[PDB]
Structure formats: structure tokens, C-alpha cells
Design a protein around this ligand. Structure first.
Ligand SMILES: [Ca+2]
Ligand SMILES: [K+]
Ligand SMILES: [K+]
Ligand SMILES: [K+]
Ligand SMILES: [K+]
Ligand SMILES: [Mg+2]
Ligand SMILES: [Mg+2]
Lengths: 379, 733
């Protein structure tokens, strides 16, 4: 009815700009302040100036807020096309403000770009062509089509860049973590939105008669259930574009799920178990112990140090070592819980010497690997 | 012959076999279900389309199995069981291998696009987050004069995630390309024809510096082979490797080509510290851009020290208002009115003069070398317009116009060759010799370990501007088999000696009179990862602590010492009464602030100074080498060794070289300033009466205890003096 009134805007906006680039390229090919502007815009979107850091944060907030408005429309709406006068609805009113901001930001970006032709084909340029022009067609008619609007979820893929431009991701595993999570979520959310468009619209060569009224949340669930290869089939696709999208989705996203889930488990499995710091009681003595710490050296040490024939004294033993303790050593450290403690660290580090309060120890004992190959190296 | 590449051959085999097997399997299932079971008279049948079978087989291949569609005939079900046994393996091996192939494309291909008037510099060699972050932090530093130069990194690797972050933060002025300077197509992509320079960075922490220098020499050979006229600035790890690139047909120092040899520079700074006890810190701080930034927990000495670290050396043109002044008037004027320390001038072909006397006039457009906090300070000397406009007395307002035998070049003392056994001594011979005010080198080497080039240490100590009676005797304590292969370079220097054995033996140390020396140098040739970074300096640390503990009852922790660290974070072990913190960088630590420690990491920012002002790098090299000219580097590159003999008065004229000395406010004519005078009063007085140019102080840390002193570079005019201070001076006599 008017879905194409919007597909027009989106698609046509893209074509006229592309043509204007091609004729400009050809005219200049057959036949300074520009570079000052290009560099200023580049410094701005890269978060290098203070105004750049502000704008870049506004992109972070308004990309999320633009997605939340899409969830509100995807949730509380019935037909894919919908008649509702623009002057009536506060959500579509505030969405115009975001679409204006993303239109300004699109031109900023364009100014900054090195090759204008390639810029007109960047993913975020397509997100902008499919989002903003239809949001203006929805003013010229008092109706709206919830067409390619799901592509707003792709704006989340800017987040790892914002959190780089703002220098807040400093560590390579934390950089890798945020890239994994944000790309996986935005690809899932955008795929769910595309399936929702296909099933609720139905097959065009069957006059849109073949259609199935899933909610967005049922598509989001259904895609997680097929990503993971569970496939309950409580929900399934029935249109032929729905089914062909599921075949393409199965070929792509099984690999993403099967590589995402392991790598998140490797990253979250990386935190140190025996961090933290020794807490000195009001009158207990302690001894710090370090060097060659293992189940053998520790069991032989404690069997003599804590032996029943010694005069009874409350001395705690504080092991400090770089390793994670082995399972049999964790058992031994648990059996002696009240008087033996273990910390990950090294006597080579002044922060670790502070954690074990070595200022306040009676002694430090430094144990040797007697069975090493090179006793000059051990010494 | 259209599939030429093995990955593209493998790609088309995977895709075409997978698709045709899927399409044919779908067709076979369609035949079975639509025909039905023959032993049930074809009554058991299910009218799937081909497209439903094609979908259904993808849904079971992937093991999803929705069961919206499923097989019901018994031949359909038996075909599904056979299909499950075969095709789960195909899908599970196809999907990974396509992801490996499509994951193989290069991310940083493409080519540099040259803007209408921006300059650029190509950078290559050892590119990593550490080397790039340290390079950019100095190259793009806020205290430099603002210039639009782009940096174009060229390297074979994919950048690591932390480096991709750094390249994104600098997006507008830093670019990265996958490639190598060894490939003529990659040299074209970065438009190296049109670069100002190529910078070739070195992995200083490699195991084999001869192998690293071989790789860097091949890169300069590649860049010069592509186009001879490119300015190449290269970092070298070994001094003997400089001879190889001096011999390339198109290497030309007069055009800008340069080799930052870190072994030469390292041993040069510590050698000048044996003559002026803190110079290596004084001087190594002038060649890294840093800005003074207080924090309220810093002690007085740390605030004084850190204000000095904010200084760098800058080049600027003196204004026309300086014309026909002598260098002494121009220096008094810069210091007293402009608050700038001028220390040299480029005299018109042209030649550098350091602290020239009253005979030298400022000519029009004379370039001068200044110590100052920022390039914005030194501009004042270009804008200074006399009585015409620059009349007023607060410096911020100046901003608008007047609207015995020597070497054959006479630079070093010289000796005819000798066998090492002429200079070898046992402990009894060494102890019988009355060594006093000497230099002790405690070398730590294995016989096979790489040559460190001790010539670069000894040669500054034999500079011809010293009289023969005032040359410090030098004794090397170390491995003899190593010193035999070192000796060929050393054999031309007078007053040298060798005590073979370990420097950790507390007898060698006593025989050498270690308590009477003017400087003990602790140096190591051992492998830079013989083990993990905690063991890397254990011999140097033990040697320091050993000397610091001895007792010389006829003491101990007052023997002067300078140690060269293979790993900067080991500086924390080097001293006690210290308050160590691993997050402080080397230049802020007490051992470096006292001139007791040195490490090659402080020399990194010489690369960028060679780009921005090559003359400043020749200024420091003439100071730290004691006068090694390019003619001497040419003569050494002939491989004859250092030729010398008696010299003519016309070459012997160069024995009046300016040198950095150190003097005490305790006694003699300057002592009047020690009793509560100010540094500006001292500066002007000494410049006028003696032509001495004062560049800093060496002051006791404990103003009351220990003998530790710290260096203050270029104090304020009003800075209070103590009678125990020592002053660094540029001087002719
Ligand atoms: Ca500075
Ligand atoms: K499965
Ligand atoms: K399944
Ligand atoms: K299933
Ligand atoms: K099922
Ligand atoms: Mg306890
Ligand atoms: Mg550019």
C-alpha cells in the first residue's frame, strides 16, 4: 500500500547521491579549506577534541535510544503497515529528533570520509538510508511502515569504537570481550527483526496471503533456539522467504554461536581465584612462604611446621606464589583453612609484598626446587 | 586455467561439492516421499515439493531438526538415517573451512592517498603497541611546534587489538598498511617517493642484535634501491654494523640519512658521566618531550627534579635584534630577558658552534640551539624586537614584530698497537699500580656473548682536548676470552689496562682500588633473555649491591657508580631508601634522577629528533663522543682501524673543543654564590668572567646523611643556591 512509499525514500535517497558521485568522478576525471574541514570532522568523530568526545557520547546514548523506540514500535503494533497521524504520537515525535541527529551525524561523517564513493556504501550509510528517509515519509503520509527499521540494531556495532575513542577499553581481553558481545547481540537483534518483517508481511508472489503473525520477541527466541541448534519447532517459519532466510541463517549463525560461546567462556574463565589480601588479626604471628610451592613441598613443610610434638603456637602460614594451586594442593589448603592461607602473587612485586603484609611477618621462608636441572639457576 | 591459487581451488571444491550433494540429496528424498513405499503398494506417500525437501535437508544437516516437515515413508526414513550419518560430518567440516578461507583476506591492504600539501613520514621495522605508543607520544607531543605531518606505518603483521585502538584514536594523522619495505609494490603504496623520511625502528630487546641489524640494513638497502634520494633514518643496535650502511652507494649524511646507533649513544652517555658525574641524566632528559605536571605528594627534590625534566633542546632562528652581538651577549640577553638558555649556534655550507667565545658574532638568520620548556617558549627569540616593540619585562608578552701522538684527525689521544698481554695485569700488579681517580669497567660477559663496543666508552675518555696528565686511567675487570675479541678496537688508546676475572670477586675490586675511582661502570654483554625479566640484570644488581656493601677501612656506599640496565623495571632493586613503585616510568625513579642508572629505553625518542632537527642530534653526538666527526667514521669504515701519529699544528688546532665539565660552589671565585646567591646571578657572572655557560645543578638529596645527589636541568633565574651544589658547565678550558 505504502511500504514502497518508504522503500522508495530509503532506496531512492541512496541512488541519487551515488549518481551525483559518479558524474562528479567522471567530470573531474575527463577535465586548502576542504582538507581543513575533512581533518576537523575526522578529529571530531574520532573523539579527539572535547566536542568530539561529547558528540561521540551522544552517538552512544542516541543509538541505544533509537533501538528502544524500535522495540516499542515492534512490540506494540499489529500490522506491518499502520495508519496513525504523526501529530498524535509522542514516541514517533521523539523519534524524529533522533532521526535528525543521525542525519546531522551522517553529514559529519561524510565530510570526514577519504573516498566519498566508498563512504556511500559503508554499512552505517545503509543503516542511515533505510532508517531516516522512511521516518520522513511517515510525516508526508499519516501512516507508517515498520519496514527496514530493524536495522537500527546495527548501530550498536559502533559501541566498541566509541569505547576506544573514549580510552576506556585499555586491555586486549576486555577489548575482545566487548567486540564479541556487542557484535553477537546486534547481529541477533537485527536478524530477529528481519525475520519478523518477512513472516508478518508474507510472500509477495503469493499476494502477501501466506503470512504468520509472530511478535518480534517470538522471532528473537526462535532465532536463539535455531542458532544453538536446539530447534524445538514450537515456533517455525512458514513463508518461503522466511524459510530461505532460516536456511541462510543456519549456514551463518551456527558458526557464530559455536565460536562465541567458547570464547566468552575462555575470557570469563581467566579471572584470578586467589587474588585479595591478607587480613592481620589483633595478635597472631604469621610467616610468609614462597619459592617452590607445590603439593609435595607444602605437604612436607606443613607436616613438620604444624607437627603435634612442637610447642603449641598460633603462627599462620601465608603462601605467596604465581601459580594457581593444583587440585590436590587446594584440598590440603582447605584442610588447614584456619591457619594456612594462599595468595596469587610474587615476592618480586612490591604490591604483592604489601598484600601479604610482609612488613609484619616474623619471617619470610624461601623454598628451593632441590630437583631442578640447574642449581645455579635456581639459586 | 582460471583457478590459480590453492585456497581459491579449495574454496570452489568445497562450495560446489557441498551444493551439488545437497541438491542431489534433496532430489532423492523428493522421489522417495512423493512415490511412497513400494511394499505398501505406494499407498504410504507424502506430497512434499522439491523446495520443502531442500529446506528439510538443510534443517537436518545442521542438526536443528524443527520437525515442521519430516519424512514418513520407510524409505524416506531410512534415507534420513543414512543422510544423518553422512551429512552431519560434511556440514560440520564445511562450515569451519569456509570460515577459515573467508577469514583469510587482508584487513589493511589498499594504498596511501596523498593530500594536496600535507607532509608524511613512512615508519617501519619493529612496529608494536609498545614501540608505536612510545614513538607517537614523543612524535606528536604537545610541546613540539605544530606541524601537519602524517605517520604511515608499513608492516607485515596484522596490528594487535590494543594497537588497532591506538591507530583509531589517532585516525586523522596516523595510517597503517600491511606490507614490507622489502617489496617495491609496497614502497609504492605508501608513496615513499614523496615522504620526507623513512624511519626504520629496531627491536632493542632481540636475542641477536647482529641479526636485527642485518634485517634493518636490508631495509635501507631496499628503500635506497627503490629511490636513492629518500632520507632514511635507521636505528642500529651495534656500532660495527654502522660501517656496512656507510658503504652503501647512496647513503649520504649530508642529505639527511642517519643511523641512531644505540650502542654508540649508550656508551657515550655513560662515558661522559665518568667525567661529569650526572650528565647521562642531565642530557638524556633533553631528548624526550615531557611536560612538567606537579602532584602535591612530591618532595622538594622531586619537584625540583621534575621541573628540570620538562626541558628539551630546541632549534630556532634568532631575530634580527641579535645581529652583531657576540655569542656571550646573545646568551646573557636570552637568559636574562627571554628566560631561554641558548647554548649554541649554526655558523654560516654551515657548522655548529657550542658556546663560542667573544670572537664569534651573531650573523643575520643565525639558527640557535636552546634549552626551554616548550617550542612556544623559544619563539620568543624569533619575535624579540628590541626597543622597536619588545620593550616590556614579563616574558609572556613577547608575541609580535618590530612594526704526544693523536689519531689522524687530532680528535683523540693515540697509541700504536699492542698485544693484549702488554695491558693485562694480575691482582698484585694492579694493586702495586697506584690507581686513583680512574674509571673501573666491571664487564660481565661470556666468551661467546656479542661485542658491546667498549670503544665507545673509552674513546670519549681519550678526547684530545684533555692533557695527557689529566686523562683518567681505565681498567676493565672482566672475562679475558671476551676481551681478546674486544681488544682489536681498544688497542690504540693510552692508559688502559685489564684485570681478567669476575667483577663480583671482592678481591678484584679491592686490587683495583674501587674506593678511590672516579666512576665504576657496571655493564653486561649477556643474552637479553637468558631467562625471564627478573633474572635479566641479576649480575649487574649483585655487582652494585656488592660494591655498595664493601668496607675500605685503611666508605663503601659512597663509591660512585653507574649501571646499565637490560630491563628498566629492575631499577627498583638498584637502590634502598627509595620507596619503589612499578607504575613509575624510569626517568622519575631515584636511581635515574641521581645518574646511577641508565637504560636504552631513554634513547628511543632520538629517532624523532633526527627527523625534526638533525643538527640537534649532531650537537649531542659531538658532546657525547668527545668529537667524533664524520671523517673519523669514514676512516673507521675503511677497516684499517684508527690510524694516528704525530699531528700538524693545523689539525692540532681542534684540541680546544667545548666540553661539559662540572664545578663546585664550595671554594674558588664562584663560592660567593654558594652563600645564598641565586642561579641567575651565578649564570651571568660565570658567562661574563669565564665564558662558562651553566646548564644545571647537581644537588644533594639529603639537605642536612647520604651522598646521593640529583640533577636539576636549567633552574629558574631566582633559584636559590647551596654551598654544596655543583654546576654543570659548557667550557673551553
Ligand atoms: Ca617540555
Ligand atoms: K543439535
Ligand atoms: K536439534
Ligand atoms: K530439534
Ligand atoms: K522438534
Ligand atoms: Mg587468620
Ligand atoms: Mg590523511
Amino acid at each position: 500500500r505504502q511500504w514502497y512509499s518508504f522503500l522508495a525514500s530509503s532506496l531512492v535517497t541512496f541512488g541519487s547521491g551515488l549518481v551525483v558521485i559518479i558524474i562528479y568522478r567522471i567530470v573531474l576525471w575527463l577535465c586548502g579549506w576542504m582538507t581543513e574541514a575533512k581533518d576537523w570532522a575526522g578529529e571530531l568523530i574520532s573523539g579527539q577534541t572535547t566536542t568530539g568526545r561529547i558528540l561521540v557520547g551522544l552517538v552512544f546514548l542516541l543509538s541505544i535510544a533509537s533501538l528502544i523506540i524500535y522495540f516499542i514500535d515492534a512490540s506494540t503494533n499489529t500490522s506491518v503497515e499502520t495508519c496513525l497521524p504523526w501529530s498524535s504520537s509522542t514516541t514517533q515525535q521523539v523519534d524524529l529528533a533522533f532521526n535528525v541527529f543521525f542525519m546531522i551525524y551522517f553529514f559529519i561523517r561524510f565530510v570526514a570520509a577519504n573516498d566519498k564513493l566508498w563512504f556511500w556504501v559503508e554499512l552505517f550509510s545503509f543503516v542511515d538510508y533505510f532508517t531516516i528517509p522512511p521516518s520522513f515519509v511517515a510525516i508526508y503520509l499519516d501512516r507508517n511502515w515498520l519496514g527496514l527499521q530493524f536495522l537500527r540494531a546495527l548501530r550498536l556495532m559502533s559501541i566498541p569504537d566509541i569505547l576506544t575513542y573514549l580510552n576506556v577499553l585499555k586491555t586486549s581481553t576486555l577489548i575482545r570481550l566487548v567486540q564479541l558481545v556487542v557484535s553477537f547481540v546486534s547481529l541477533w537483534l537485527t536478524a530477529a527483526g528481519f525475520l519478523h518483517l518477512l513472516e508478518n508481511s508474507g510472500d509477495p508472489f503469493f499476494d502477501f496471503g501466506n503470512a504468520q503473525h509472530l511478535t518480534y520477541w517470538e522471532c528473537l527466541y526462535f532465532l536463539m533456539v535455531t542458532m544453538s541448534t536446539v530447534g524445538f519447532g514450537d515456533i517455525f517459519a512458514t513463508t518461503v522467504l522466511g524459510r530461505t532466510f532460516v536456511v541462510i541463517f543456519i549456514m551463518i549463525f551456527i558458526g557464530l554461536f559455536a565460536s562465541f560461546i567458547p570464547e566468552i567462556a575462555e575470557i570469563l574463565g581467566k579471572r584470578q581465584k586467589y587474588g585479595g589480601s591478607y587480613k592481620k588479626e589483633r595478635g597472631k604471628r604469621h610467616v610468609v612462604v614462597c619459592g617452590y610451592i607445590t603439593f609435595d613441598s607444602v605437604s612436607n613443610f606443613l607436616k613438620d611446621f604444624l607437627h603435634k610434638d612442637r610447642e603449641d603456637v598460633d603462627v599462620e602460614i601465608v603462601f605467596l606464589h604465581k601459580g594457581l594451586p593444583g587440585l590436590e594442593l587446594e584440598g590440603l589448603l582447605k584442610r588447614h583453612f584456619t591457619q594456612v592461607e594462599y595468595f596469587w602473587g610474587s615476592v618480586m612485586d612490591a604490591n604483592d609484598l604489601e598484600r601479604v603484609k610482609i612488613q609484619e611477618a616474623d619471617a619470610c621462608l624461601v623454598l628451593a626446587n632441590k630437583y631442578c636441572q640447574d642449581p645455579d639457576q635456581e639459586d | 586455467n582460471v583457478l590459480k591459487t590453492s585456497t581459491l581451488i579449495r574454496l570452489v571444491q568445497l562450495v560446489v561439492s557441498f551444493v551439488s550433494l545437497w541438491l542431489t540429496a534433496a532430489g532423492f528424498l523428493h522421489l522417495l516421499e512423493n512415490s511412497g513405499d513400494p511394499f505398501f503398494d505406494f499407498g504410504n506417500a507424502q506430497h512434499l515439493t522439491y523446495w520443502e525437501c531442500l529446506y528439510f535437508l538443510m534443517v537436518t544437516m545442521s542438526t536443528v531438526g524443527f520437525g515442521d516437515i519430516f519424512a514418513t515413508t520407510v524409505l524416506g526414513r531410512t534415507f534420513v538415517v543414512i543422510f544423518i550419518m553422512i551429512f552431519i560430518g560434511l556440514f560440520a567440516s564445511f562450515i569451519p573451512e569456509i570460515a577459515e578461507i573467508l577469514g583469510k583476506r587482508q584487513k589493511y591492504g589498499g594504498s596511501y592517498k596523498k593530500e594536496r600539501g600535507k607532509r608524511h613520514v613512512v615508519v617501519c621495522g619493529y612496529i608494536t603497541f609498545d614501540s608505536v605508543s612510545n614513538f607517537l607520544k614523543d612524535f606528536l607531543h604537545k610541546d613540539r611546534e605544530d606541524v601537519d605531518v602524517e605517520i604511515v606505518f608499513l608492516h607485515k603483521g596484522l596490528p594487535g587489538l590494543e594497537l588497532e585502538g591506538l591507530l583509531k584514536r589517532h585516525f586523522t594523522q596516523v595510517e597503517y598498511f600491511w606490507g614490507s619495505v622489502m617489496d617495491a609494490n609496497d614502497l609504492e603504496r605508501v608513496k615513499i617517493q614523496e615522504a620526507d623520511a623513512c624511519l626504520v625502528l629496531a627491536n632493542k630487546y632481540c636475542q641477536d642484535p647482529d641479526q636485527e641489524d642485518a634485517a634493518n640494513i636490508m631495509r635501507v638497502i631496499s628503500i635506497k634501491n627503490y629511490h636513492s634520494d629518500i632520507k632514511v633514518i635507521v636505528q642500529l643496535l651495534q656500532y660495527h654494523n654502522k660501517a656496512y650502511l656507510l658503504n652503501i652507494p647512496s647513503w649520504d649524511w649530508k642529505r639527511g640519512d642517519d643511523a641512531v646507533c644505540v650502542a654508540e649513544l649508550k656508551l657515550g652517555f655513560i662515558a661522559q658521566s665518568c667525567l661529569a658525574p650526572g650528565f647521562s641524566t642531565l642530557m638524556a632528559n633533553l631528548f624526550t618531550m615531557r611536560s612538567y605536571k606537579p602532584t602535591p605528594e612530591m618532595s622538594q627534590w622531586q619537584t625540583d627534579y621534575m621541573r628540570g625534566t620538562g626541558m628539551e633542546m630546541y632549534t630556532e632562528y634568532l631575530s634580527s635584534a641579535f645581529n652583531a652581538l657576540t655569542f656571550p651577549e646573545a646568551a646573557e640577553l636570552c637568559f636574562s630577558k627571554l628566560k631561554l638558555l641558548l647554548l649554541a649556534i649554526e655558523v654560516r655550507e654551515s657548522t655548529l658552534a657550542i658556546n663560542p667565545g667573544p670572537k664569534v658574532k651573531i650573523e643575520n638568520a643565525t639558527q640557535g640551539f636552546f634549552i626551554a620548556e616548550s617550542a612556544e617558549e623559544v619563539k620568543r627569540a624569533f619575535y624579540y624586537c628590541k626597543n622597536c616593540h619588545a620593550n616590556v619585562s614579563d616574558v609572556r608578552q613577547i608575541k609580535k614584530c618590530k612594526c704526544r701522538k693523536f689519531d689522524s684527525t687530532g680528535m683523540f689521544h693515540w697509541c700504536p698497537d699492542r698485544p693484549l698481554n702488554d695491558c693485562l695485569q694480575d691482582r698484585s700488579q694492579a694493586s702495586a699500580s697506584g690507581l686513583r681517580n680512574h674509571v673501573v669497567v666491571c664487564l660481565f660477559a661470556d666468551a661467546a656473548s656479542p661485542l658491546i663496543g667498549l670503544r665507545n666508552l673509552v674513546m670519549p675518555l681519550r678526547a684530545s682536548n684533555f692533557h695527557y696528565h689529566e686523562l683518567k686511567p681505565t681498567i676493565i675487570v672482566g672475562n679475558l676470552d671476551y676481551l681478546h675479541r674486544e681488544w682489536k678496537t681498544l688497542q690504540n688508546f693510552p692508559k688502559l689496562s685489564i684485570l681478567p676475572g669476575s667483577p663480583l670477586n671482592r678481591a678484584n675490586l679491592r686490587a683495583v682500588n674501587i674506593n678511590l675511582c672516579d666512576m665504576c661502570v657496571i655493564v653486561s654483554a649477556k643474552d637479553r633473555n637468558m631467562e625471564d625479566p627478573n633474572l635479566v640484570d641479576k649480575e649487574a644488581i649483585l655487582c652494585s649491591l656488592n660494591i655498595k656493601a664493601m668496607t675500605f677501612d685503611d666508605a663503601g656506599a659512597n663509591v660512585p657508580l653507574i649501571t646499565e640496565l637490560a630491563n628498566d623495571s629492575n631499577v627498583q632493586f638498584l637502590d634502598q631508601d627509595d620507596d619503589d613503585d612499578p607504575d613509575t616510568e624510569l626517568y622519575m625513579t631515584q636511581p635515574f634522577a641521581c645518574g646511577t642508572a641508565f637504560a636504552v629505553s631513554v634513547l628511543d625518542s632520538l629517532m624523532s629528533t633526527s627527523y625534526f632537527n638533525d643538527n640537534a642530534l649532531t650537537l649531542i653526538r659531538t658532546l657525547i663522543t668527545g668529537g667524533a666527526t664524520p671523517e673519523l667514521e669514514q676512516i673507521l669504515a675503511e677497516g684499517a682501524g684508527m690510524r694516528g701519529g704525530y699531528c700538524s699544528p693545523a689539525v692540532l688546532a681542534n684540541r680546544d673543543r667545548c666540553r661539559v665539565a662540572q664545578i663546585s660552589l664550595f671554594d674558588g671565585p664562584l663560592a660567593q654564590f654558594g652563600q645564598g646567591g641565586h642561579y641567575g646571578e651565578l649564570f651571568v657572572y660565570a658567562l661574563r668572567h669565564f665564558g662558562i655557560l651553566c646548564i644545571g645543578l647537581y644537588r644533594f638529596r639529603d639537605t642536612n646523611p647520604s651522598s646521593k645527589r640529583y640533577v636539576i636541568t636549567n633552574p629558574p633565574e631566582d633559584f636559590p643556591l647551596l654551598p654544596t651544589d655543583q654546576v654543570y658547565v659548557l667550557t673551553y678550558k
